[PDB]
Amino acid sequence: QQKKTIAVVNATGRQAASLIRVAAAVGHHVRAQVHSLKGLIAEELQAIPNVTLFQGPLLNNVPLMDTLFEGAHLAFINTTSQAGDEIAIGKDLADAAKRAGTIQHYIYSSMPDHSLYGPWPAVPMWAPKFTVENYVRQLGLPSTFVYAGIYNNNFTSLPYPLFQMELMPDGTFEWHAPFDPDIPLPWLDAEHDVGPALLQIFKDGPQKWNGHRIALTFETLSPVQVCAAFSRALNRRVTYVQVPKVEIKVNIPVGYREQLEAIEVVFGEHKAPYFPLPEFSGGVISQRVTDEARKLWSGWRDMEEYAREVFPIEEEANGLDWML
């Protein structure tokens, strides 16, 4: 029963970092790729004895992938669009894993392609991952796909798009977005809950989870309910305002702009589900989107805890002063 070695990429990202911290603490050795060794998170992870970092780009660097998977038995792969070529990278990684011959369970962090379920456009930073998921499914090794809910800690009072908990002149907070005020959205405390859930999937094993899609969300809340949780947590007035166009108050990469534009159409105009797949939609009991995740990890944290216990600290660390 010796803890198996786990290979991961984008180690400094919230999903991977969450898994690495808890995995290492319970005995797993981790082989982790990082784009660069500098930075608070990379430095923190390098200081963990059970962790070995491998710095370099994923883009057109299969050699790094072969190195990463050498001696690994488990994998948790979450890519990004940063370098472009996310589909090619996700496929290269999967091929490298299969090539290693030792990967018993490959978990890929996937997202939906909304254009497959309704008269909706594909959200650009999500649809590509589904393509990688389809490719991975065809490979001869067990694989499981996790779909991340919206991160509680996307929220900030800095003028960043879509998830700004704006501090008003009078001390009150307002969150403006295209999401319908009352339709429940899936949320996730990435930092605390992704790691433990992923570890449980690995503990459960490939026979139980091969071919499965798991919604990594532990609570659903409408925008109005999110604001009410921040209000209870902070003892301040927090209200939601639905706006057709995302308020883009800072310069952003074009790819992100296109992501936001698709979101205005999908959620603003169409009010489509965040998880549009059929399976995520006397005595008879239908499965709720949060069922599997909660069964995987019972110690999950809600939005109210985030708002009251973590948000003030993240905000202070970002230089904000409202909590002073």
Ligand SMILES: NC(=O)c1ccc[n+]([C@@H]2O[C@H](COP(=O)([O-])OP(=O)(O)OC[C@H]3O[C@@H](n4cnc5c(N)ncnc54)[C@H](O)[C@@H]3O)[C@@H](O)[C@H]2O)c1
């Ligand atoms: N924020 C959410 O609510 C949410 C929900 C579902 C899915 N996702 C998906 O999560 C993915 C990101 O994963 P994450 O949340 O674990 O990470 P992250 O957003 O926490 O950070 C990514 C890290 O990767 C580094 N990085 C990645 N590619 C790089 C490159 N080519 N050059 C330099 N640095 C690079 C960045 O500096 C950064 O520190 C995205 O593809 C997104 O679509 C996010």
Ligand SMILES: [Cl-]
């Ligand atoms: Cl193990």
Ligand SMILES: [Cl-]
């Ligand atoms: Cl990284």
Ligand SMILES: [Cl-]
């Ligand atoms: Cl870095």
Ligand SMILES: [Cl-]
């Ligand atoms: Cl180390």
Ligand SMILES: [Cl-]
């Ligand atoms: Cl398969």
Ligand SMILES: [Cl-]
């Ligand atoms: Cl700017």
